[PDB]
């Protein structure tokens, strides 16, 4: 019984070569190079997922300290407010209220200023 | 073969790029007073003739 390669290898290559569609130049036409790229990208994506968090963690903090500044306080001071004033509400994200419903935000600014000191 | 030698296969893009200015241009032709045919300027041509 001789088991020639047969279809197998082609299929494996093509399977991958699809994954690499769109990649610049020889890096989507040659199996070998595309593969090498995918390795990297796989690791990239997975590392950037963990990042996506950090990025918005920040994006929101800027907005907050932004509109939180208009009423008259540092993000630091403002946080200390709601963290002390019981409101574990507004996961930083939902302090998007600064954009729609500024009044609601403002409510949270005095509530904070107050119980803060 | 000897001393200087290309370090890396020219990219198929970087190649065609070099061929930027390679395209040709149409010959400059004109209708002649003689026949209705076309001549290049300043040139006696068949089906036509000239004058002195």
């Amino acid at each position: 019984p001789r088991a020639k390669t047969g279809v197998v290898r082609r299929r494996k290559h093509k399977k991958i070569l699809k994954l690499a569609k769109g990649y610049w130049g020889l890096r989507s036409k040659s199996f070998r190079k595309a593969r090498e790229t995918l390795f990297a990208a796989g690791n990239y994506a997975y590392a950037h997922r963990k990042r996506r968090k950090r990025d918005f963690r920040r994006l929101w903090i800027v907005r907050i300290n932004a509109a939180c500044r208009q009423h008259g306080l540092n993000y630091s001071t403002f946080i200390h407010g709601l963290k002390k004033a019981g409101i574990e509400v507004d996961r930083k994200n939902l302090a998007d209220l600064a954009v729609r419903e500024p009044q609601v935000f403002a409510e949270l600014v005095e509530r904070a200023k107050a119980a803060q000191g | 073969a000897k001393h200087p030698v290309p370090k890396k296969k020219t990219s198929k893009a970087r190649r065609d790029a070099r061929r930027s200015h390679h395209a040709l241009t149409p010959p400059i032709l004109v209708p002649c007073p003689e026949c209705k045919a076309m001549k290049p300027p300043h040139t006696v041509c068949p089906e036509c003739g000239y004058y002195a």
Partner: protein, 101 residues
């Protein structure tokens, strides 16, 4: 009225009636669950003690569902170390209804 509910370990606001996908939840295929877990309102309701001591949001479990597959794919160089996991994450579809405060 805007209404911030917490659930599946994540905060989201909610409009009177609309579809929302949330971390999978233990409930019937088509039942109803309250997210008594709720903060604020569109008529200004600072959530004092973390949660409003009295308020609720009602929603219908429009159905469960998996999610488009992601390829978690580790690769450590010089060390022939490759790993390819497929991962699709479960969830459920809440249709909002009563934001009864």
């Amino acid at each position: 009225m805007f209404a911030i509910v917490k659930t599946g370990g994540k905060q989201y606001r909610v409009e009177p009636g609309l579809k929302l996908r949330v971390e999978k939840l233990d409930a019937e295929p088509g039942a109803t669950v309250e997210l008594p877990v709720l903060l604020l309102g569109g008529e200004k309701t600072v959530v004092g003690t973390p949660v409003v001591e009295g308020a609720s949001v009602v929603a219908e479990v429009l159905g469960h569902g998996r999610g488009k597959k992601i390829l978690v794919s580790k690769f450590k160089a010089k060390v022939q170390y490759r790993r390819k996991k497929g991962h699709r994450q479960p969830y459920t579809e809440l249709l909002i209804k009563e934001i009864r405060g």
